[PDB]
Each structure stands twice: as C-alpha cells, then as structure tokens.
Scaffold this motif. Structure first.
Motif, PDB file in Angstrom:
ATOM      1  N   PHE A 139       0.846  -1.181   0.000  1.00 11.81           N
ATOM      2  CA  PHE A 139       0.000   0.000   0.000  1.00 11.81           C
ATOM      3  C   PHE A 139       0.879   1.226   0.000  1.00 11.81           C
ATOM      4  CE2 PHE A 139      -2.838   2.900   2.585  1.00 11.81           C
ATOM      5  CZ  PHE A 139      -3.655   3.256   1.535  1.00 11.81           C
ATOM      6  N   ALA A 140       0.360   2.314  -0.593  1.00 11.73           N
ATOM      7  CA  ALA A 140       1.148   3.565  -0.671  1.00 11.73           C
ATOM      8  C   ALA A 140       1.671   4.043   0.662  1.00 11.73           C
ATOM      9  CB  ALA A 140       0.314   4.696  -1.283  1.00 11.73           C
TER      10      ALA A 140
ATOM     11  N   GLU B  75       5.692   3.411   1.359  1.00 14.59           N
ATOM     12  CA  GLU B  75       6.629   4.388   0.770  1.00 14.59           C
ATOM     13  C   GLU B  75       6.356   5.824   1.258  1.00 14.59           C
ATOM     14  OE1 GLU B  75       4.559   3.298  -2.851  1.00 14.59           O
ATOM     15  OE2 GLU B  75       4.588   5.400  -3.621  1.00 14.59           O
ATOM     16  N   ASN B  76       5.081   6.160   1.555  1.00 19.90           N
ATOM     17  CA  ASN B  76       4.796   7.542   1.936  1.00 19.90           C
ATOM     18  C   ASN B  76       5.426   7.881   3.256  1.00 19.90           C
ATOM     19  OD1 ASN B  76       3.362   8.164  -0.364  1.00 19.90           O
ATOM     20  ND2 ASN B  76       1.334   7.871   0.585  1.00 19.90           N
TER      21      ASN B  76
ATOM     22  N   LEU C 284       8.939   8.726   2.426  1.00 17.16           N
ATOM     23  CA  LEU C 284       9.085   9.991   1.702  1.00 17.16           C
ATOM     24  C   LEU C 284       8.742  11.182   2.569  1.00 17.16           C
ATOM     25  CD1 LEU C 284       7.445   8.690  -1.482  1.00 17.16           C
ATOM     26  CD2 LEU C 284       9.816   9.479  -1.370  1.00 17.16           C
TER      27      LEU C 284
ATOM     28  N   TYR D 194      -2.378  -4.078  -4.998  1.00 18.25           N
ATOM     29  CA  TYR D 194      -2.857  -2.701  -5.255  1.00 18.25           C
ATOM     30  C   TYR D 194      -2.738  -2.409  -6.749  1.00 18.25           C
ATOM     31  CZ  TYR D 194      -2.669  -2.774  -0.340  1.00 18.25           C
ATOM     32  OH  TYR D 194      -2.858  -3.138   1.000  1.00 18.25           O
ATOM     33  N   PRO D 195      -3.491  -1.459  -7.283  1.00 17.12           N
ATOM     34  CA  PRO D 195      -3.611  -1.388  -8.748  1.00 17.12           C
ATOM     35  C   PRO D 195      -2.414  -0.764  -9.447  1.00 17.12           C
ATOM     36  CG  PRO D 195      -5.109   0.126  -7.667  1.00 17.12           C
ATOM     37  CD  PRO D 195      -4.538  -0.702  -6.570  1.00 17.12           C
ATOM     38  N   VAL D 196      -1.584   0.019  -8.744  1.00 16.50           N
ATOM     39  CA  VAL D 196      -0.419   0.654  -9.382  1.00 16.50           C
ATOM     40  C   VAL D 196       0.805   0.340  -8.531  1.00 16.50           C
ATOM     41  CG1 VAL D 196       0.597   2.838 -10.288  1.00 16.50           C
ATOM     42  CG2 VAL D 196      -1.909   2.459 -10.312  1.00 16.50           C
TER      43      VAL D 196
ATOM     44  N   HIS E 183       3.586   5.256 -10.760  1.00 19.94           N
ATOM     45  CA  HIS E 183       2.729   6.456 -10.704  1.00 19.94           C
ATOM     46  C   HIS E 183       3.219   7.602 -11.582  1.00 19.94           C
ATOM     47  CE1 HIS E 183       0.559   4.741  -7.297  1.00 19.94           C
ATOM     48  NE2 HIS E 183       1.723   4.434  -6.744  1.00 19.94           N
ATOM     49  N   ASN E 184       2.289   8.470 -12.007  1.00 17.37           N
ATOM     50  CA  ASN E 184       2.667   9.666 -12.760  1.00 17.37           C
ATOM     51  C   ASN E 184       2.842  10.788 -11.746  1.00 17.37           C
ATOM     52  OD1 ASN E 184       3.222  11.545 -14.828  1.00 17.37           O
ATOM     53  ND2 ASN E 184       1.047  12.034 -15.094  1.00 17.37           N
ATOM     54  N   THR E 185       3.899  10.664 -10.991  1.00 20.67           N
ATOM     55  CA  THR E 185       4.325  11.721 -10.081  1.00 20.67           C
ATOM     56  C   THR E 185       5.710  12.221 -10.457  1.00 20.67           C
ATOM     57  OG1 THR E 185       5.385  10.213  -8.504  1.00 20.67           O
ATOM     58  CG2 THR E 185       3.015  10.718  -8.222  1.00 20.67           C
ATOM     59  N   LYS E 186       6.025  13.461 -10.059  1.00 18.80           N
ATOM     60  CA  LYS E 186       7.370  13.981 -10.310  1.00 18.80           C
ATOM     61  C   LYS E 186       8.434  13.099  -9.676  1.00 18.80           C
ATOM     62  CE  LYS E 186       6.324  18.847 -11.117  1.00 18.80           C
ATOM     63  NZ  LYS E 186       4.834  18.797 -11.032  1.00 18.80           N
ATOM     64  N   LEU E 187       8.147  12.541  -8.489  1.00 18.62           N
ATOM     65  CA  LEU E 187       9.140  11.685  -7.849  1.00 18.62           C
ATOM     66  C   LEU E 187       9.456  10.496  -8.743  1.00 18.62           C
ATOM     67  CD1 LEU E 187      10.681  10.671  -5.181  1.00 18.62           C
ATOM     68  CD2 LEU E 187       8.637   9.368  -4.797  1.00 18.62           C
TER      69      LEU E 187
ATOM     70  N   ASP F  39       3.752  13.436  -4.849  1.00 21.21           N
ATOM     71  CA  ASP F  39       4.861  12.506  -4.614  1.00 21.21           C
ATOM     72  C   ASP F  39       4.589  11.602  -3.419  1.00 21.21           C
ATOM     73  OD1 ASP F  39       6.208  13.720  -6.703  1.00 21.21           O
ATOM     74  OD2 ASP F  39       7.638  14.777  -5.462  1.00 21.21           O
ATOM     75  N   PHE F  40       3.933  12.144  -2.381  1.00 22.55           N
ATOM     76  CA  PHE F  40       3.584  11.401  -1.171  1.00 22.55           C
ATOM     77  C   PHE F  40       2.403  12.104  -0.550  1.00 22.55           C
ATOM     78  CE2 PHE F  40       4.885  14.152   2.233  1.00 22.55           C
ATOM     79  CZ  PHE F  40       5.705  15.038   1.576  1.00 22.55           C
TER      80      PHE F  40
END
Ligand code: NA
Ligand code: NA
Lengths: 439, 439, 439, 439
Positions: A154-155, A158-159, A162, A382-384, A389-393, B291-292
């Motif tokens: 799950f996000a 990593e969150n 970060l 989880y789906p991604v 992800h399409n994030t700048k990171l 990003d997070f």
C-alpha cells in the motif's frame, strides 16, 4: 497432548485441523488473554474445547441462504452487533472521564499488544502510517537516507519514508509469497542505506531470518511493516521495530485510525515515544528534548474501543483461515488445469487478503466477467506499483527501475472476497462464479 | 433594533452586555446554525430571548457551593452529561454503518465548519498539527524554505514547519496582545521566505490587515494558526489558509484528535485534500498524483462526535466571555496598584486561555504561593520559548536569536483557570487567592 | 468530618442535607458495595463527592417540561435504559450456561444482600410471599397457631399465614406511623401465639426495640415483613427473620418475582433452605429431611438481573427521599390549615409509598377531583382492610374485630405519586393540583 | 396419502418412520402452530418435507467426534444458540415495557398452550408445584383429605398435597410402564379420598381411561401430573385438570421456573385463577373473594422466553424419539440375554427420561462401573421412594406401607443420558459402555 491456544496463527491452524478431524486425538486449553475472549466464549467450556462444535453450522451459521451478489468488502459486515454493544458499554465509562488524548485505556492497550507480541515496549499511535514515520525517525533516518522496500505495498509504506525526506530503494519480490526477495536485497545496499523495510503483505510473513542475516552484515536496521499481519506466530523475532495498524478494515481494527510501534529496544522505544508527541520528553508536555515531533499517539477513546474489539481477533482469524483453506481446496481443479495459481496453507499467514494468480494473460477478463456476468466483486491490492505512478518523484527517480517478478505478478494477481463475517453461502457463490468463468 | 446572534465572538459580547442590563435598547434573535443549538435551546423561546435569564443561577448554577481546591483544567469538567448523552446517541447510528474512515459525517462537519467560517473549502483532518503540515506542503514549501512565526506558540506550530524540512524564522510579539508584531515581520523576510504563520494565541486574533499588507508586497502566503480561536468574528478574512484544531480541550473539541484546513482557494484546497490522504487523486484511491501524502483526514466517528459537541460552541464561548469579564473587573485593583497587567475585553477574543502579567519579577512567587498556600493551580502556556528548548536544533541554529518583548513577557505571564463549566464559586476562590496573595 | 456512604437511608439523608447546604462543610466517600454502583458513578469522582452537582438539573433533569397528566405508577418508567443495557449484558453471560434454577448468580445475590443487611444467612426466594411462608414454617408454625400482625398490609402478609393453616390475630396500628402499635400486642398474646409479624409499611420501620422487649418476655419469634423497606438503616436489628421482596415495583426489583429470607440464626436458616426446596437436605436433591417443602428458591436468571438492577438502589432511594422532602415542604400550608396531615422526615423511611391523610371526611372528594378535574392519579394502598374482606374466613372469624385507629386512618389515607424516575415537573403538577383542590 | 404434523408424539413417530424409510407411501405437511416453528424451518420447504434429509448428518450433525466422557444432563447442552438469540431479541422488546408481573406474553402463552393441549382454560403459573397446589385447592381439598398417587414420582407431587394439609395415599405401579396401577387404585379408596393424582412419569402416559372409569364410580376428581409429558398425544382427555411444568430441564422449558394449569372446567379455572393470585377476584386486585391465595402466576418475562423456546418443542421431541429408538434397537441384545429390560416404543411417550431395568441385582454394579471405568454418568430418577424418606412424617404415617412392585423396580431402575442436543457419538459411547460392562 494438551496445547494452549495462544491466539496466534500457528495454534489457529492446529485448532482448525482438530475441528476437522485431521488430527491425532488432541486436547486444547485456551489462554485467557484478551485477544482470545470471543474464542473462549464461543468454543470453550471449563477451559476445554466444546465437544459439539460444527464449523459450518455454529461458526458460520450455514443455512442454505440464497445469495444473489457478492461485494468485496462491505464495511457494515466488518463489525458485529456484539462488538457494538460492548463499544457502547466502554464508551459509557470513557466519556465521563474526559480523557480524550492520552489516558489509561491507551496504556492498557499497549500492555495487551506487548503481551500478545511478546515485546517489551509498545507505543500506540494514531495510525500505522504515523507509526512507520516515527519509527524511521527513531532509528536516525535523515533526509537522503535510503530505505530498501518492495514496490507492491500500500502507498502508506513508501509515503512514510518519503514524508521524512528519505529515499525508497525498490527490490523485487520472490516467486512464491509476494514478499521482498532476500536474495535481491544485498545488491541494492549503498552507503546511504539505513534500513530494510520488509512488508508482510496480505498477512503472510517475509523470510525474516535471511533478511536479518543480511542486515547484520551491513549493520542495518530492520523495521517490519506488519500492518496486515497481526496474530502471525513469532512476528518480529528478527526485527528492530514492528509496525502495526489497527485501521478498521484490518484483521483487528478500532473505529477510526490507530496503530502501534512494537520493540524490545528501550532506546528506540524512548525516541519513538518522544517523536510521537512533539519531541517532548516522556511525560513532560511542552518541554522538547528532540528537535521536533508529530501529534501521533493513539486517542484514548480508540484504545478503549480497541480493547473491546480485540476480543474477537483470534476467533476472526480462525474464521479467515477456514475460508482460505476452503478457497484453496475447492479451486484446486483450476490450478490443475493451469489456469490459476493458488496460495499454500502456511502456519504464519493470517489471511488479511486472499490472492490468486490468473495466468496466460486472462486476469482482466476474469475480473471483469466475474463482476459483469456473475455479480462478484473482486479487487487488486494494489492497482499501481510504486515505480509506476505519474508523479514527479517517479518520473525523476524511478524510471530505470525494473522489477521483473513484481511486474509480472502484478499482471496476474486477483484478490477474492475474504472477511470473517462472510457466509459460506457467499463463498460458494464466489467459488461457482470462478469455476463457471473458467470452463 | 434587532441583532441576529451569529454564534461568533462579536455577537456574544453584545448579548452579554444585554444580559447584564448594560444595554436594553436591543432585541435579539439567533441563527439556526449548528454552533448555536445549545444557546438557542437554553436562552431563547420562539427565537426571542427568554425574559427571566439570571446568568449566575441559570447559566452557572450558582448555589453558594463551598470550594476547597482549584485545578487549572480538569478534563472531566470539559464535557457535560448532555454532550455525553448525545454522543452515545449518535454513535448508535454511526457504529452499525461500519464507516470508520471517510464517511458522511466527515462531509457534514466540513459543510458546517465552512458555513461557520464563511469559507468555500474545508478539509477535516486528524489533527491541527496535521492540518498545518498539509497546508504548508500545499503552498509549495520545500526543505530549507523559511516560515516567519512567533516563538511563543504551542510546539505544534514550529513542529509542523520542521517536520517537512522547512526553517522557522522567529519574530517578536507586540506590546498588547501576545501576537506576532507586524512591525517586525518585513525585516525578517529573506529570499527564502515563503510564508507568514501568525498565531491567534489564547483565543485572540492577530492584526491580520497589516500582516496581509506586508505579505502582498513580498508575494508571500499567509497560513493562520487559528487552533485556539474558533468562533472569533471575521476569522480568516486575509489569510490564504486557516488552520483549526478540534482537540478535546479546545473551545470546541471532539473526543480525540481532529482539526481542519479552511480556504477559499480551490487549487490549495485540492492539494490539501490530496496530501491529506497519501497523495492520491481525490476519489481515486491508489493512484498517486502527488509525490507522497499522509494518513491525515478526520475519522468519520469523530466527525459524528463533533456534530454533537459543536452544538454547545456559541453557548460555551459566551460562558467564557462572562468569566473573562469577571476576572477583569474583579482583579482591576491589582492592576491599579501596578502589580499585574490584565487583558482588555475585545470583540474578537474567544478566551481559550486567560493571561495575566505579574510584573516586578513576582510571577513565580505568586504561582507557587497560590498552589502551596491556597490550593489553586495556575499555569504558564507555554513554559519554554521556541528558541530556548535545549535541543540540538536550538544549539545549532537559534542561539543568537533575541526576542526582547517575547522574553520579557515570558517572565511575567500566568494563566488563570477559565473553562465554561467552571462554577462561579470556583472563580471566586481563584479571585480571593489572587487578592490575598498580593497583600 | 468524613462519612462513608453505606447505601442506606441514614446516610442518604445526610448526603441530601449536604447537597442542600443544611450542614457543615462535610465530606463524603462512598462504600464500594454493589447497591452504591450508580450513586458512585453519578455523584462521586476519585472517591469524593463531585463539586458540581445540582440536584434539580443533574439528578432530576429539570428543564421546565410541560406536563399534562400524572399517572400514579407507570411501570415503563420504573426501569431505565441504563438498567436494560446492563440486563442484556448479563443475560448474554447467564443464558449459555444453561443454569436456570439455582446457580452462581443466586449465590452471589445472597452474598450481596447479606453484606448490605449485615446478616449472616440469606436464602433468595421466588417471591416475598414465598419467603414469608417458608420462614413461618421454619419457626415451627403448625395449623391453628396464631400470628399477631396488623390489618392494613398488602394481602400477601396474611395470605402467607393462612396458606400454612395459621391464624392471623389483628392488632391496631399506632397514631403516627401506620405501623403495628407495640402497646396493643401483649393483650393479643394467647397460648397459641407463635410469632409477631410487624410490617414496615410504605418503607417506614416499626418500633422494633419495643416489639422485641415484648417478644423476649414471652419468648416469641419476630418475623419482619420488610418487603417495602429495603435500604432502611439498621433493618432487622431486633428480628429473628427479615423478609424481603424484589418484586419489580419495589424500591429494588428484578424483572419478575423474587424475594429473600435474611437471618443470623443458623438453625432457622437451614430449615428455611430445606423448606424452600421440597424439604430436601441442603445440597441433597431428592433426599427429604423435612416432611415437605415448596419450590421457592429464586431463579438464577432473576438473581443475575438483580445484581444489575441493585446497582441503582441507593441512588433511586436518594431520589425518593428528595421527592418526599419536597412534598412535605410544599404541602405544609395545607397541614397548617388543618386540611391534611403529612408524614415526617425520619432517618429510617425509604419512601416506597408516600401517604398523606385528608381529614374531615374529604378524602374521597379530593381523590376523585384530583383525577377528574386535575388529571392526577392517586391511589389507596390498600383499599380493603384484612378483617373487612367479603370472604367466608372473615364472616366466620373476624366479624367482632374492631381496630379503631386502623379503620379511622383508612378513611383518610391517600398515596401521592412517588417514584424515582419522576420529573420534578411532574411532582409540581401534583403539588398544584393538591393546592388548587384545597382552596 | 397426507398427514399434517400437529407437533405431538403420535405424528413425530409417524414422521420418524418416514424419515427412516419404514414408510414410503406417506406425504407430510406441518401445522403452523408455535411448537412446530423449528421443525417447519429445519425439515420443510413450502410446507413439504425436504427431499434430502439425513437424520444423522442434518439433524444430529454426526461428524465422527471422538468422545471422552458422558454427563447425564449437562444443562449447558439443553439450550441452543438459536434459542439464546431469539430470547435476547424478545427481551429487548419486553424489558422497555416494564411489564414484569402480568402482561401480554403471559396471556399469549396461555393461548398457545390451550391450543396445543386442546383445552379451554389455561392459567400459567410460577411452577408446576404451584400449579398442582392451586389445582388441589380449586377442587376443594381440605386438610386431612386423601389423594391417591404413586410413590415413585418427583417429590413435588407429594409435596403439593402435603403443603395444603392433605394426605398422600400411595398405590403400587403397574408391571409395564412405571405408572400407577389402575387395578390397585380402587382398594385404596376411603371416605376421605377426594382425588386421584396419576403421574405421567418419564414422559409416558398413564392408563387414563381405566382410571377415569374408577373416578366416575367413586365421584372423584382426577388431577394429572403431566409435568414430564408435554407433547404427548391426547394428553388430558380424561382428567379434570392437567398440570404442566415449564422447568428449564423439561422437554419444553423457560429460563427459570414456570408451569400451567389446564382444564375445560370453567368453575375450576376461575378458582385456580383466584387462588394463583392472593384470592382476589379476577381483575379486581386487593379485593379478596377466596379466603387466601398465593403469588403463583407466571412472570410475563418467562412467558416471553417460553414463546421463543417452545418453537423448538416438536423438533426436540422428534430428536428424543430417535434417541430412544436407537437405545432400544442397540441394547436389545442385553434384553435378549435377560440382563436388562428395555422400554417399548409407544405413540404417547415423549421420552423425557429413558428408563432401563438392570435385573439380578446388578444395577448398582453397572452404574458404578459405567462411571468409574468408562466415565459415563447414569442416574436414578428418583433415588428414594416417597414412603422411604427419613422424615418424621414417614416414621409417623408410612412405616406399614408396602408397594412390592414399586420397591422391586426401584432396585433395578437406571436412566440413560437422553437429551435432544446430545451427539449420536455420545449415545454410541454410552451404548459401547453398557455392552462392555455386561460382557
Ligand atoms: Na452540575
Ligand atoms: Na407461644
């Protein structure tokens, strides 16, 4: 042979095998710990197993009820009227105290969790995500340090890394358990690496003995993300810190957000206590000893709720194992036809989520037809993946990551409905759809 | 000749003057917003002020009780049985839904707060600290960016800035209100300044018109720490984002941690909503666009509790203004004798905390003697200034900071017990001790 | 001075006087016995009286509710939701044990009652009528033996005597308390007398010291009908056996029929135990040692209900005293005008029923007008005296009985609504009707 | 051909023969009376027998459980979770009414019992013993009147007679059913006889046609003790009054004490109703019409419980008949070998208790060895005959009584565990022990 049921996964499996007669003549006692309260009431009499237990009729209330559709996780079904009645009773005690930040129920829940995890120090937090963030700070993580972790959690995992300015370093998963591959960890170690963050995904434990052997060579800490694994036997044996979540949809949850930090290391436990409450010295409000901190202790009210709901944990975990076994045994034909891959029964899994793999590229067709043709919701936890992800990171840092197993398995995985208040009629409805959609 | 009571501080002061017969020229009605519910039930009949209101007997239940001791903030006294009864009632509706993360009570509380604040967008959070961290990330704060703030707030204000890697830059307070001195802000602006973070300390609003004038010259954001100032008239007129806390000991609280982000700026509101839940796109779990993020939205259960407890806000704020006025009038001789300085009554103050200044170095003696000889607890909110904690951060970055007014006021300040369910006999006991200790 | 509240009538009066400021600075702690559970929760904090108690608003929930009629004893009002929630909780414990005759909750309630009455032996029974019948047999009553008793009790008292073939001998009541006149007992003693059976009618104790002086001269047993007097201080000090009823409409009730036999006399207690269960030797089912017996023990389920309901006993009795005092004080004018006579406040009365006397022949007119003109129900406990029923027994045996005081008082008595969940608005409605009907 | 199952013993035997395939040509429907509720839900669909009924799996949950010990009547096994759930549901409706003495559930249960018994009048009582006492008084029994009865019943039968001062006159039992021998009744009649009190012992009905022939010749009443025979077909055809017990361990029970008086005789029903509540006129509390009475009606709460539990009666009676047939068939070898005598299957028996006779003096040896060597509890209902208790009454009045067949059978009787929620594995364990002890 007499066995004391401790409320963990290994003894739930032994109890299940006995209830189904796969056992030598065995006898059971139940430990009078809070996570066994419901199991002791429902299945024991005079500290012995009741002789007249029928799993399907008495534990699952089977009655040939007609089922017309399946939702994956209807949240009204995750709490029972018994739990509600108890929660109202304990709220009638907590509310007149006015103790709504820390308080005595927070301390009691920390003691209960410490006893259940067999760890010396517990800091009950406002969330598992907060627990992870605080634990990373406590081992000294500074901005720019690297934390090795898998890319399929799950996000929140990593969150937490970060949010404190650290850098996830992603390592591929193994070929058998959805967990970080110990054989790929060492090649990702750099001079910036400070921690290995394995995730016990879906309620299955990672291979922690091998991970600790690597950590010790490189003098790394291990923080385990056990947010899906409460109850798993010997959880945390090799970890510096173990993170729990009591989110309301976990195997054990409160009625809001909560989590915990568990450790035997007194220095880390002190620093966790300080960072979880503004950097203040322990029990010295407004007096900082660390440079800053968060507002991340559990609410006393949710700790009181937790002490009521945790009574159902070992019993709900037993129900999960039974449902998992029943999927494995009744879907075996699809695996013999090489259409799917099933999980194996192991003594550490607490079956928070039930993954299968649909191979030969058919996962999306089977998922979509189960819903549209058979009215069965399934889901993908989880789906991604983290590096997709399409994030700048991601676009700046993770575009050259290739995680071959993770990415292949991600094309195949599907989670089937599995929650302890499910009816066996409902699982039968899922089983028949899975068979029909694969004829 | 008619005022409609809006539930905010200005109209509470006007009503109190009416209730005391200072004016008799005005008639009152009351608006039907949720924060006015208790006041309307208690003091109005058919939207007309009751004719026989005795403040002492009807609002404070004055009974010539015999007092033996005073605690500064006994948390059992901050919640009433009527509140408890209503909370139990609403939890009997929430609990069977199983909706313990997001839910419809969260959204309703956001709507009630938005109307009460006259702001378009409200993100209810898991705390005021989390609200502030999220709001700072939403305006683009990056590590090393500077945030101008006072040094006399609760630690949460500086901690939210530090937690995301930004740099507090402390400015002195004024000579009249404990709030940041607008005349000292411009000289602290550097190329790294991104935000002014004024604090509406003790319930009193800062001079926001002047701070906005400076912020516009330098194209800075303003994020207002209003965690103690709910109910203050015209709160947030000039700020980009306003932060609320619903901590249980605030003028309005839930039964655990909660807060809110309030703004008229849709772009900021969207980012705040994304950062408050893991960086996911709004209504698209598991798909990150930032990003997070954190796990920082309010619990639906606490939102439900909030919609019950906020019914008492305007009424409890009225009780606070009455208490503050009573301290001012009955301690005036101590100020006429140049022993203390008292606050003035102003239409914006919601009287979360009641500060006095004990001058000529006597503050410690008075505090100690009140407790030891008179059994009266007073307190100092807050005992250590931001640039004076003994932390590694302070030793590295803040040793040359000198905040002359802040540091001198800090040697003089003392807060007196003031909470809405206090008895007037309890306030009289405080008054007698303060007068007696200064003979 | 420090006083421990025991849960009985004397201490309730002292607590009420303190609450109302009719005493010194007096301090209280509360005994942690089951009948004090609710009082301790509602009125105490840290084993000391709460400072912020307002009787009218906190205990009686006064709110100027509009009242349109009064019923004397609406039985739905005698049980609170808090009691119901607790009863459901304990039923979930008792029901799966299957123990529905004697069992552990019967034993525990015997122990609680024994502690509360300071007596060594308690036999909990299926009703107060059964307790009286068993107790009369245990002292050796044979057919034709005489029992001296008053004529103004509920029919149960005489019926227990008649059911075992004994003969009521009626003695007149005193001039002040509705209780048997000790000065009329001796002249009724014959060679057949075996027992004096005083009744503590309406909650008021008889003059037991004087009744014991007579009983000792004549070596007679005293069995006290205390079925309306639970909680009365020093109950049973001079009696050989005390009878209790826990009928649901007593000051303490279960949710069905039950009662108790209380004694310090082991011989009597043993025989009571045997007669209450078929004449069997104690704990020897199916083995008789007495010639016969009854099926008259309490139900284990009702004992479990009793353990929950008794938590409210001292607090409900306190509410009764306050209501009684309020009738006495507010109707004083009518006694001054020589229209009625009021009870006096005494330390023993637990105010099960609240008698007044309407003199000058006006009782029927006042009762009928209170209902038809003022919508107030009052009642006459009891409508027919024992020697005046139209039965063969009375025609054969009681036609020459003249009980002058009993008969005169019977023409004047009227009972006013009094039950602990009454609103003061409801009592005010009664008071206004009584004043108005007597202008 | 088509049978509508009435819920009584004859139809249960017919249904059992069909379920076992000893009948093939019969179709079954089931009537909608409350005692059929559970049978209809479990065994029927759309008022037709389910096609797939396996008695061992579906009704007894046979699963090859390994048994270690047998208790005779473990009271926790006599109530099911389904019953408990229903009881909690109904008590949530009864408790808020506060109707705990009389009330509408009492009346409804009286109606249900009247329909089930095919009788016009039912007075639901606080126990079977109280029902018997009241019924004896209703037919005019005076002290010294004689009541003919067997000497092998539960002590309540004789005790009800003794408690009202009447004289049991014992008559020997027959040679085939454990019931009073009609051929011995006439010789026991004297001028003082007023009643014959036959007992339908162990669930078997007495020969009532022959006893009614005698009663009519001698102008005697018949009160039938049917406290163990609820559900027996044609129960009470010849009796003046029929007595039931709803004690919790009977074939139908409540959760505490209760019973009933059942009659077609309106004069007797009226007198029973008056005697059961203090001698008062029906629905004229406090006005006596009989000289005395008892406090002996059912509790409204237990009536509510009984309306839930009686749903299970016909189904639990069906399980008992299967168990009894299984004992008869599987023990027949011991009877062929002239070691024991077994009961015979008859259409009236409801199998409350299951008697065998162990002859040649071996009963005590068999009972002791079954317990010491095989951990099987058996019991003797009842261990002391009426004329053999060591009481003053027996030594005064019953020393010359000789009841040759009662006394001989008493030396041989042994009861085997038989209760509807026993496992067939448990019965097999009893069977194996009894065969092994008789090698
Ligand atoms: Na109060
Ligand atoms: Na005598």
């Amino acid at each position: 042979t007499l066995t004391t049921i401790s409320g963990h996964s290994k003894d739930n499996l032994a109890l299940l095998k006995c209830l189904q007669g796969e056992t030598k003549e065995k006898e059971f006692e139940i430990s009078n710990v809070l996570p066994n309260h419901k199991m002791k009431e429902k299945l024991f009499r005079e500290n012995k197993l009741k002789i007249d237990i029928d799993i399907e009729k008495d534990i699952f209330n089977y009655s040939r009820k007609n089922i017309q559709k399946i939702e994956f996780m209807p949240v009204n079904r995750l709490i029972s009227q018994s739990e509600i009645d108890g929660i109202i009773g304990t709220l009638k005690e907590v509310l007149p105290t006015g103790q709504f930040t820390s308080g005595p129920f927070s301390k009691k829940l920390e003691e209960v969790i410490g006893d259940y995890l067999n760890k010396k120090y517990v800091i009950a937090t406002s969330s598992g995500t907060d627990a992870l963030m605080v634990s990373l700070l406590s081992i000294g993580i500074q901005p720019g340090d690297e934390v090795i972790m898998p890319a399929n959690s799950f996000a929140a995992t990593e969150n937490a890394v970060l949010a404190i300015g650290a850098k996830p370093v992603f390592v591929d998963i193994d070929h058998k358990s959805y967990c970080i591959d110990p054989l790929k960890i060492e090649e990702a170690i750099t001079q910036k690496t400070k921690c290995i963050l394995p995730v016990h995904l879906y309620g299955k434990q990672c291979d922690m003995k091998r991970i600790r052997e690597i950590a010790d060579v490189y003098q790394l800490r291990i923080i385990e993300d056990a947010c899906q694994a409460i109850g798993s036997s010997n959880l945390g044996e090799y970890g510096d810190i173990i993170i729990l979540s009591f989110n309301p949809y976990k195997n054990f949850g409160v009625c809001g957000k909560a989590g915990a930090i568990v450790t035997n290391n007194e220095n880390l436990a002190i620093r966790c206590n300080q960072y979880s409450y503004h950097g203040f010295e322990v029990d010295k409000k407004n007096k900082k000893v660390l440079d800053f901190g968060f507002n991340s202790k559990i609410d006393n009210l949710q700790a009181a709720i937790g002490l009521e709901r945790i009574k159902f944990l070992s019993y709900n975990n037993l129900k999960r194992v039974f449902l998992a076994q029943r999927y494995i045994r009744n879907l075996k034909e699809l695996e013999d036809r090489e259409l799917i891959k099933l999980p194996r029964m192991t003594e550490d899994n607490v079956w928070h989520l039930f993954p299968i793999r649909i191979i030969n590229g058919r996962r999306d067709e089977v998922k979509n037809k189960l819903y549209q043709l058979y009215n069965i919701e399934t889901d993908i936890y989880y789906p991604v993946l983290s590096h997709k992800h399409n994030t700048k990171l991601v676009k700046k840092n993770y575009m050259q990551d290739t995680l071959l197993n993770t990415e292949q398995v991600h094309k195949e995985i599907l989670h089937l409905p599995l929650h302890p208040n499910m009816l066996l009629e409902e699982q039968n409805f899922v089983l028949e759809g899975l068979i029909n959609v694969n004829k």
